[PDB]
Amino acid sequence: TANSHLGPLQISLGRMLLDILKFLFIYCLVLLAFANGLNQLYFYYETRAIDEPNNCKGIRCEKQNNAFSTLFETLQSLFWSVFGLLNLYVTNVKARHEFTEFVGATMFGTYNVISLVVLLNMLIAMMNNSYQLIADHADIEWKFARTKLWMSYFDEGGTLPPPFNI
């Protein structure tokens, strides 16, 4: 805030943070719904770490497995699928249950569409709308913030820096 070029930008970003927090609620509700559904579908096919290669279990292994066996793991998998770090073979069970595998794949695809095609674009649109209004009064807010920052060094209390103030 002490700089003439970065201060207004920082104020604007801090002003948009609240609306980011607003979208977080809807995203969390959608995530919880789909996690509940996927865990309910897939909890019958849990496997122990002994039978997996390298004795590794979860989605942080080189060969991802047991992605939807527990609610916590399902939440983590659905979070990491936002950035594309979950592979497509995690929807396959060891047995040949093609109906179950297809239903799980359709659930995953619907979640991907809803999360990555709709919600993010709506977030971008309302970010643009918020910034349009915020950009008008950037100077006044930045100068108010800089005045508040300056006034904290006028008084004579706490003159010494923390290494020397004890």
Which structure tokens are listed for 88?
A: 């497509």
Window 88-107: residues binding a copy of itself (CB under 8 A):
88-89, 91-92, 94-101, 103, 105, 107
The residue from 28, 47, 51, 63 that contacts a copy of itself (CB under 8 A) is 63
The residue from 4, 54, 128, 165 that contacts ligand Y01 (CB under 6 A) is 4
The residue from 32, 40, 43, 79 that contacts ligand YZY (CB under 6 A) is 79
- Burial category of 74 from C-beta neighbours within 10 Å (exposed 0-12, middle 13-18, buried 19 and up): buried
The residue from 17, 25, 62, 166 that contacts ligand Y01 (CB under 6 A) is 25
**Crossing angle between the packed helical segments 7-42 and 71-80, to the nearest 10 degrees:** 130
Residue 89 interacting with ligand YZY (CB under 6 A): no
Rounded to whole angstroms, the Cα distance separating 165 from 158 reads 7
Q: Which of the stretches 37-45, 49-57, 98-106, 154-162 binds ligand YZY when contact is defined by CB under 6 A?
A: 98-106
Measured CA distances, 41 to 66, 93, 126 (Å): 13, 11, 35
How many residues lie near a copy of itself (CB under 8 A)? 82
Measured CA distances, 19 to 16, 25, 57, 127 (Å): 6, 11, 37, 8
Contacts of 18 (CB under 8 A, 6+ apart): none
Window 32-91: residues binding ligand Y01 (CB under 6 A):
32
Window 107-126: residues binding a copy of itself (CB under 8 A):
107, 109, 112, 116-118, 121-126
Find which of ligand Y01, a copy of itself, ligand PTY, none residue 138 binds, CB within 5 to 8 Å per kind. Answer: none
The residue from 3, 47, 110, 147 that contacts ligand PTY (CB under 6 A) is 110
- Burial category of 98 from C-beta neighbours within 10 Å (exposed 0-12, middle 13-18, buried 19 and up): exposed
Residue 149 interacting with ligand Y01 (CB under 6 A): no
